């Protein structure tokens, strides 16, 4: 649509919220694959952030790729590292779900603010596979990754 189409030029950061993500109830409901800032770059934001993000961006992306097959066609016609990424992407997915403190009316949850490190680290860890044996709901509606672990434990009963 031309309007949004135009808009981008005038932007510096776009938050495109994904109807799908939203639809997954995930709140953050983002279309993270177009919630962006041009000002993403190791140069600017330090590479760690950047890279991790790129690893993520990627991870989702690859994952994205599969989806079309899997959609009718499930797994095992895929390798399990693909599964790993998928899962990770999924954990991550859930991890982006980060509750809403404001809208306890909507959520009941209290929402989180994640100071950056828990984020950078957070993903580095999941990526590190450090989370890759936890229940995915652990990341679901959490902010700081530790809490996801905490949440994991209890979700692990």
């Amino acid at each position: 649509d031309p309007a949004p189409a135009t808009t981008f030029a005038h932007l510096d950061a776009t938050t495109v919220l994904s109807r799908a993500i939203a639809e997954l109830g995930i709140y953050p409901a983002v279309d993270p694959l177009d919630s962006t800032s041009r000002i993403m770059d190791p140069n600017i934001v330090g590479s760690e952030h950047y890279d991790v993000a790129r690893g993520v961006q990627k991870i989702l992306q690859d994952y994205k790729s599969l989806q079309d097959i899997i959609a009718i066609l499930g797994m095992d016609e895929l390798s399990e590292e693909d599964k790993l990424t998928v899962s990770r992407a999924r954990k991550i997915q859930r991890f982006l779900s980060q509750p809403f403190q404001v809208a306890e009316v909507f959520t009941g949850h209290l929402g989180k603010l994640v100071p950056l490190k828990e984020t950078i680290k957070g993903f580095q860890q999941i990526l590190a596979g450090e989370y890759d044996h936890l229940p995915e709901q652990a990341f679901y509606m959490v902010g700081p990754i530790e809490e996801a672990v905490a949440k994991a434990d209890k979700l692990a009963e």
């Binding site: 959609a71 009718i72 499930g74």
Partner: protein
């Protein structure tokens, strides 16, 4: 993408779908057959083991596993692949036997050496007892002599289910010649071997047939799944289609007229 693309997809996807059913029912038919055969077989392999485990069987102080040729019949094969790969360390000459041509690169690539034999035509035309004997006979007449031994196959449980089963293979005729087993014998080292033998074929057959049957159903399933999957998916697309389709149409009339016969 555009209706084209979408259709390209759609088109092919049905084709697939159709195909997917084609593979499916053929397999299901095979399945039907597979069931039948399972009757004498059922007995038969079950029998072997009810000698072996009329009594029980033991080890001294080899494995064999079997599966199909193709995938897309679930990960049926992967299971045996898995479960024999798990084994081997302990052993006690080592051999593995993977009959299977799925077990062939899901397992003939590790034990591609420590395999004793592998058989092909592992399904993909209907295998029979004859084959079990075939595969049996020379196997004996081998130089890897049997140390340990388990037979891993997909034991069918119902079409819906198999559990990759395992048995012990104690072809090693000193299992037979020994223990209480010799006390359940009550007659010499001929028939000992020649049952150990005979029963090995029975089980081989059986196990195999269970496997293949499992496979047969698993392929059905795999082929099943898909043709359903396709169906839903079509359903979404076909809209997306339309929508863009009219969207277009309409919209062009706009540009054509009043959009460009606005005054044009």
């Amino acid at each position: 993408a555009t209706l084209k693309d979408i259709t390209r997809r759609l088109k092919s996807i049905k084709n697939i779908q159709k195909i997917t059913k084609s593979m499916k029912m053929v397999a299901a038919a095979k399945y039907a057959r597979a069931e039948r055969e399972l009757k004498p077989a059922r007995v038969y392999g079950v029998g072997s083991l009810a000698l072996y485990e009329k009594a029980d069987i033991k080890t001294p102080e080899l494995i064999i596993g079997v599966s199909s040729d193709r995938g897309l019949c679930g990960a049926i094969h992967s299971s045996v692949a898995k479960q024999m790969k798990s084994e081997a360390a302990n052993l006690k000459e080592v051999k593995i036997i993977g009959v299977g041509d799925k077990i062939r690169s899901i397992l003939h690539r590790t034990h591609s050496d420590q395999f004793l034999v592998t058989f092909k035509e592992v399904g993909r035309r209907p295998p029979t007892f004859g084959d079990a004997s075939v595969i049996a006979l020379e196997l004996l007449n081998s130089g890897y002599e049997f140390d340990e031994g388990s037979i891993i196959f997909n034991r069918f449980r119902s079409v819906i289910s198999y559990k990759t089963e395992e048995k012990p293979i104690f072809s090693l005729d000193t299992i037979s010649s020994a223990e209480s087993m010799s006390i359940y014998d009550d007659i010499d080292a001929d028939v000992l071997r020649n049952y150990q033998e005979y029963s090995l074929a029975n089980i081989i057959y059986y196990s195999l047939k269970e496997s293949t049957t499992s496979e047969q159903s698993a392929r059905m399933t795999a082929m099943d799944n898909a043709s359903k999957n396709a169906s839903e998916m079509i359903d979404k697309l076909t809209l997306t289609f339309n929508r863009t389709r009219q969207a277009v149409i309409t919209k062009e009339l706009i540009e054509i007229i009043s959009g460009a016969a606005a005054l044009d």
